[PDB]
Amino acid sequence: ADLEDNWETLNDNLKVIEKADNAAQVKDALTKMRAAALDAQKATPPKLEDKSPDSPEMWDFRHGFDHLVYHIDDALKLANEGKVKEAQAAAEQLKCHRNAAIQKYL
Ligand SMILES: [V+3]
């Protein structure tokens, strides 16, 4: 449930999606990404541990993962229409959201 472990999980599943041939392979990888994003959202960084939940610092941290989840869910909508190619392009765009949610807290 480490933040770094959740980042690894997200990158593992993005690779699976880029290699995928069918929408079910993509769907399963996106499902795992959503779980990893929600687990990451719980992994408050040591430097923010003492911050109030209502603090702007924690608002930013939490909501980076909310945003990643929103678009994982949009990519799921595509995988659930058998649109393998469209869901793969949506997945590629998740890298930017992943970076925005996690990179500055590593
Ligand atoms: V958005």
From Swiss-Prot:
Any one GO cellular component localisation term in the record: periplasmic space
The UniProt record lists the keyword ATP-binding: no
Binding site for heme b: W7, I102
Keyword Electron transport assigned: yes
Manner of cofactor binding, per the entry note: Binds 1 heme b (iron(II)-protoporphyrin IX) group per molecule.
Origin: domain of life: Bacteria
GO MF annotations in UniProt: electron transfer activity; heme binding; iron ion binding
Disordered: region residues: 38-60
BP terms from Gene Ontology: electron transport chain
Location within or outside the cell: Periplasm
Keywords linked to the UniProt accession: Electron transport, Heme, Iron, Metal-binding, Periplasm, Signal, Transport
Basic and acidic residues composition bias: residue spans: 47-60
Named cofactor requirement(s): heme b
Protein family according to the UniProt entry: Belongs to the cytochrome b562 family.
Protein's job: Electron-transport protein of unknown function.
Subunit composition and interactions: Monomer.
Name of protein: Soluble cytochrome b562
Covered residues, full protein: 23 to 128 of 128
